[PDB]
Amino acid sequence: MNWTVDIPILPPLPTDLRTRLDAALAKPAAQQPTWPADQALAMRTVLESVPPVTVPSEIVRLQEQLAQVAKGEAFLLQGGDCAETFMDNTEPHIRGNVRALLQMAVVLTYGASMPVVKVARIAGQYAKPRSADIDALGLRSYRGDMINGFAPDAAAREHDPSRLVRAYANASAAMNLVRALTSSGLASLHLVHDWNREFVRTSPAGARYEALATEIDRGLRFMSACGVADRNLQTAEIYASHEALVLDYERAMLRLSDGDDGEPQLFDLSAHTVWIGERTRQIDGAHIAFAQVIANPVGVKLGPNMTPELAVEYVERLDPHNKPGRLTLVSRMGNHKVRDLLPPIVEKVQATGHQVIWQCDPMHGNTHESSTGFKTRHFDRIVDEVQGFFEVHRALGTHPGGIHVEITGENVTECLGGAQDISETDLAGRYETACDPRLNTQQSLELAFLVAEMLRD
Amino acid sequence: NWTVDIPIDQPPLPTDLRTRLDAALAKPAAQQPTWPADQALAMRTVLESVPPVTVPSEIVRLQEQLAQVAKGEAFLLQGGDCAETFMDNTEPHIRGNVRALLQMAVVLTYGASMPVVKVARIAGQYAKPRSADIDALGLRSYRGDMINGFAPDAAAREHDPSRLVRAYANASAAMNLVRALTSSGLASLHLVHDWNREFVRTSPAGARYEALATEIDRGLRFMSACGVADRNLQTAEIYASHEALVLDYERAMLRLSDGPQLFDLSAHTVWIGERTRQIDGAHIAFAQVIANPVGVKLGPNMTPELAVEYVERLDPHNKPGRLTLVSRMGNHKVRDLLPPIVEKVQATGHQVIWQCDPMHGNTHESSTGFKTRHFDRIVDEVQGFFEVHRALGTHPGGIHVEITGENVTECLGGAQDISETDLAGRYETACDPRLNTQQSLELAFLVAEMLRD
Amino acid sequence: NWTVDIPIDQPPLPTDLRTRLDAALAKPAAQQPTWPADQALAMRTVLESVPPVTVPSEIVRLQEQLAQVAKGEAFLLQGGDCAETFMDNTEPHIRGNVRALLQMAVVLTYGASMPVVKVARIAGQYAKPRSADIDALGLRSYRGDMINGFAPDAAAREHDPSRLVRAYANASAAMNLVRALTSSGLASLHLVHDWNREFVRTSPAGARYEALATEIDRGLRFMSACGVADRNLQTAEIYASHEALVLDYERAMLRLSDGPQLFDLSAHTVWIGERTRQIDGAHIAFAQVIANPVGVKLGPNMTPELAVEYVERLDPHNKPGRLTLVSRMGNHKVRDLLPPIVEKVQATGHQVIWQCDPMHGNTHESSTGFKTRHFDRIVDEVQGFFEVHRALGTHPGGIHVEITGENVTECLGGAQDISETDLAGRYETACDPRLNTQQSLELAFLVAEMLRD
Amino acid sequence: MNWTVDIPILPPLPTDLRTRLDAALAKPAAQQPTWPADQALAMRTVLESVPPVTVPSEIVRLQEQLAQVAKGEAFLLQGGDCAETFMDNTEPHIRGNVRALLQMAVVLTYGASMPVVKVARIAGQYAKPRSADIDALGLRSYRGDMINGFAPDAAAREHDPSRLVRAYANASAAMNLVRALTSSGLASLHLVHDWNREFVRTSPAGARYEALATEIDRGLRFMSACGVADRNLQTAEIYASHEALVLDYERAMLRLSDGDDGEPQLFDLSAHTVWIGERTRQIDGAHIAFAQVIANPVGVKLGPNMTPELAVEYVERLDPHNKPGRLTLVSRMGNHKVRDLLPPIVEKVQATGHQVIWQCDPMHGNTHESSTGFKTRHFDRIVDEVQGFFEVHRALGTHPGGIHVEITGENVTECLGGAQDISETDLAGRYETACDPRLNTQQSLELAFLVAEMLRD
């Protein structure tokens, strides 16, 4: 059946912000759903008065934490599903993904010797681009639950604007849980580290990670021995992110800030931070213009065809004021290319004077199709791209700022390798992703161990 | 018709607890909606797998804080809209209401000299009883947005079980925002006190309250002067609550904690109303089975003996703070009716919270046709509630009020001297008349003196 | 003769700082003792290698706190005995005096709404000037226990340089105890406030002070109610001070910090008296060379121009809080004499602390023969000091008083209404009349209102 | 020359405390100086109204911290000079000894994974017993500066009661400094650990201790990474101790407590805690009786002739109320005997039901005379006694509670071995002790490293 919401019935935007927003959205937009303009407008009119998913003073705080990242005084961890679905938007799946990110944070905080800014891909990662409008079954392609349905039939693939509302309801629901969990006990550093201790005990490669787990453990005991005040160990902040892709959803989630802090700006309150993907980063297109008008922190994906010069253009358009950490540039090159392609981008951007975050995405450049027909990534390539991203920064004297991974708390079978030795035949058991293969819980924690050893190197 | 339809798609609680629940839910349930069972079932099935509004470790913490209230070492402040509506579940309304709680809370904490457990009527108060089969307009009565529409038209008033899911979405989106605001600066004690100072400055009776405002300011500066660490001044906990009325909604929102007890995860704490508190009815049998702290409204027809049976039913293990008895008597009846009830419950050896709802027994109709409440009657029920406890050496434990951040004209009186003619300007409640933001801060100050006195 | 002799046994400061010191110390020094140079030297040699009374990082912290006082963001409270004696350097006396500071401090912190830098006249105040060549009894005048004996007999009054070492031992043993008491529970704010409550309860004017006592109590409970972390309520810092008078003692106690500047490590902060503040004399040239915060007493003969030369000499680098100008004018003269001095020093652009000593210009002789001070005159000098600063928009920075924990009868008046006849009962000071414990708490309350007013 | 103090001119002691104290001091007392009774009494009358060196609420606190020790929830470190002197009672020598104890504490806190109760032998360790009244030069023996002079001449050796006063003045002076230093910066955990980092860098055996120093370092950085409240890292408490030997000094430093906490008792305020030595622990003698009347925590030295049965008698006389941590029993057996003699003492005392602190003194049973004529101890024996004290407790299931060592911050040449390889010829350079050989600063820190590895084992 259906539930039903009302299309509703206040000071207008500041004149310059109206002008600028309309000039942004007048530009060409790639990868947009194709539904009618009237039905879209009704849906945006619903979203324009819902309670936001985030609030501006959180975005201001995240921006300050990311400036520390940009200055080399913190490390950025971002991860969660490749594609959230409505049907898997459930308490166990959310807790599971929050717990996996947390588990990784413990180990990276200890390896980096500095705070880790924890950013979940969650509460709105419901839209994807596609290179092909017709997929391999010859159906109109799945573009994520905010657009159409996974089910491999033609009605299910029709673009349905009512998905904008269901996507918001599902997002704000998740966010409520993520906040409940982070403040009420899941994020206690003691509990989360006990889980890491249970992984080291049962993992097939646990003997390799025992020494570092033991050190963290004596580190934690050292704290209670010296009598530190411990409430800061009880809770952590998990922020929300997703690809800003569907411009009808992002424009309708825009809100003007109150001016008490800074003079009023437009924040996208569908998320704390958002990024712009490889297929939508046209320099003069609507997504880059949009990013330029919102106050949030933003990132741009940079793949193997990126030039140093285009990089610098992104930095000048998106960090026009030189605000450390407003712009993250998220390298995804493939492990076999990172060490060649990244260095001259980093040099040209470092010489601008701006302070970007350098972030490694070691997933999206390392995808292949298995003999068994599944889209998969090999753990050792994902690892090796991070290795090589660390080598580039070390050679340059610049900061390996963080990683951006697709992970889950579930024990799926989606990426090959790890300690578990996920084989091509194994992929059949629990291939559950609605899009790209994610590291399972064990694989994601193994990678934090390995990355903790790069941070220590 | 200016709507948009949102499609619904389509492991169970344990057998032993399901067997206990179905036994309790075979009891007759008053005031339930009349939708088809098969549609109710469908909608319960959706809600049995949605992410929860609250989590068990939050409720367990609330129980600890409420235990401290029961024992005379904390004060319970519960307030917000009489009735939430889906169309007024907006960011400025929700903020406004949190703001008004928080401002009352600063003044009450200072006046009590102890912590204040801050519980909003919010993120689910979407259902109400009715006495009237047919309202004045000859329509089926409005029952709250979880049941039907406010709109005085026959189609709006048919009972729609899909509203179960709309209520949930609106409840979680609301709770998301309440969490976000109370963690990220709205619950800064300094900033909330600054709003209290601007009220004292511009209020018409602001002269009367200036002295206490200045003492608070100087109690604040004293903290800074002594160098205390300040992060616990930066944020506050606002718990969620509503009347537990729709048993289709409340049972679907049940979850087992991870150990393992049954919690209702639609709210932190829920109460049973004056019309559904049958000692052998399902609402009571539901309150019995859940581990959340629970409240029961006790109006002027209550007997000591019946208030005891509530205690034996709802607090069988003698957990202080688990049960809150909520007096609502009328200002003219509190001093007489409440003492016997207190004496007899105290004598059981159980520690209940004694909370005053000075709103619901003090409602009258104005010559201009609006349902309304005098400000002075409301105050004087609290004053009396206080006298009762002082006389008996028992704890005046908290209050339960209907308030909003908005500058409505719903209750008469207060410093603004809302008159019978002012009622029409902004009377916006979908149900009972609320204190507006000014009247609710004024009531906090006046109660803060009863605590000091 | 009821004494026991304790034998004395027997790498230097750097050449460049020793060359600076000897240049400054070639200046004439008033009020110095008349013992043989060779004996002075011997005794300086002992004191140049003894463990220090204070350490440089303590003084550096004091300078930071005193900077905050200079800038109008803290208040300076300095008090204790006019003259310490070796035979009254006992555990109950020392505790009593710390106790009396700390109680004044609670009330001043609340009344100021900012932190209070707590500096005792203690652990070295063992030397005094004299005007009189020959006292009334026809004896050489007593000069303080670091110089000679109080005992009115010719042998006691000969200047004994071995008293340099006795002073040091008594100073360090005293400071040991002050550190121990302020770390281990005597400086608990709660417990100190409890003493303040028992004073309000038993004092004859306790009625007058009850309201502020109750506000403090409620500002305290408010902290607990808000859950602040409390370790900074458990202890307090009490710094040491005395008049820097015996240059043989003060120069021997010099040390280089470890980097490197010169500190006098006989005290945290030291002041120059009204009789030794010659602009070209050695006391001033000594204050110039040390890095400690310093004070200069400014009596009714001071000129604006001379108070400026103190600023240029003693605060050459413009370090706020480094220099404290200590007004002591008489209550009848403060309102007239002080404003010009403030205007002219302010105009230099330097930030000095402006501290009131309401004791030394308000001393009179009673018909019963005792040196005494009216309580009301003392209060009214502070009141005036306050009016002066308010008028000019400058900071009334602190006070400097002579107080003890004991229930002496030295100053007239106060709530106890000490009369000319009461003076003989317990007049025990070896020098000037002190506020007793009651009168000193009474003065804190009354000053706390000048701060609130 | 001389300085001069006055022999002075209040509620009498509670009748039972008078009676008990006099009954204690009526018993025979070994090792007491032999000066006239009238001159003694004058000196005690001076001491009876001086400001105490410690106060009762500190002793109450230390007792609570030592009960945690007794329960196995903390570790006790006690050390400083074998014999303080008046002439070396100077700022550098005191800071030096405080710094060395601190440096050791950092490493033991981290090794134990639990707090360390820091107890200095300081501010009154001015008296020693002697087996011989005539020494090897045929002079009346040196008994410590509270009794007579080190100088090897007969006048200097006369017993001089005025030394009771000079001993107090010197003690309270030191204590004032120790308190100044602990609260004002010397005891910052960051500074003290930087010093440990400089030792590991320059020590000849530094490469052996680098790994553990590095772990502590990442542990400390882990704390700032997680944002702990850090004032508890700024300061530490150093307590005062010495051998309670001279009964004229200890009786005159007795003070009655105020009753606000517990009902009034006699505390010895010359120290926080005191111990009774091998030569003065006669079961029915004045020192054991004295210890029984004061409220302080106490210890008794136990050497190789101790029986399990006599041990239990000490426990029943000195911990009559079963108060954990009131009684420490301080094993000194010699490294070659500890593993044989300690176990049956521990079993008999454990079976009483009382909770003593078990403390290792690995110095006093391990002393020998070198070919070069110096009293010396070999580092490897001192180490091996601690090793063996750990082995006894591990085998029993009981708590290796702490160590009691003689150390200094100076780079003296008094104990053979260590990383520095202090040879018999080396002892000549800087043999500075007025009594037994102390570990120098480097040797004391090496031993903390080694003991930290026993705690980790």
Ligand SMILES: N[C@@H](Cc1c[nH]c2ccccc12)C(=O)O
């Ligand atoms: N609050 C700190 C420490 C912390 C608490 N829980 C955590 C879980 C993982 C990592 C760190 C933490 C932080 O978020 O950094």
Ligand SMILES: N[C@@H](Cc1c[nH]c2ccccc12)C(=O)O
């Ligand atoms: N966190 C404390 C104090 C506090 C912070 N913000 C507040 C706002 C209102 C009342 C109290 C507070 C509490 O909830 O009690």
Ligand SMILES: N[C@@H](Cc1c[nH]c2ccccc12)C(=O)O
């Ligand atoms: N430690 C704080 C508060 C405090 C503790 N004890 C006190 C005693 C008196 C005055 C203040 C205090 C301070 O010194 O300011």
Ligand SMILES: N[C@@H](Cc1c[nH]c2ccccc12)C(=O)O
């Ligand atoms: N205050 C804690 C931590 C600490 C501070 N400084 C230290 C120096 C050494 C060891 C520990 C510490 C303690 O004493 O245990």
Ligand SMILES: N[C@@H](Cc1ccccc1)C(=O)O
């Ligand atoms: N309150 C609005 C919009 C909304 C829908 C779902 C969740 C939150 C808000 C409605 O019910 O139509």
Ligand SMILES: N[C@@H](Cc1ccccc1)C(=O)O
């Ligand atoms: N994920 C489910 C249930 C749900 C509805 C609304 C909000 C949150 C969850 C859906 O989309 O139907």
Ligand SMILES: N[C@@H](Cc1ccccc1)C(=O)O
């Ligand atoms: N105050 C006494 C005792 C004393 C001596 C030395 C130090 C401390 C106290 C005196 O000078 O005689």
Ligand SMILES: N[C@@H](Cc1ccccc1)C(=O)O
């Ligand atoms: N240690 C020296 C100096 C000293 C005297 C008094 C107290 C402290 C130190 C002495 O005994 O003479």
Ligand SMILES: [Cl-]
């Ligand atoms: Cl449009």
Ligand SMILES: [Cl-]
């Ligand atoms: Cl019914």
Ligand SMILES: [Cl-]
């Ligand atoms: Cl002269």
Ligand SMILES: [Cl-]
């Ligand atoms: Cl005797």
Ligand SMILES: [Mn+2]
């Ligand atoms: Mn992906």
Ligand SMILES: [Mn+2]
């Ligand atoms: Mn109502």
Ligand SMILES: [Mn+2]
């Ligand atoms: Mn004086």
Ligand SMILES: [Mn+2]
């Ligand atoms: Mn020894």
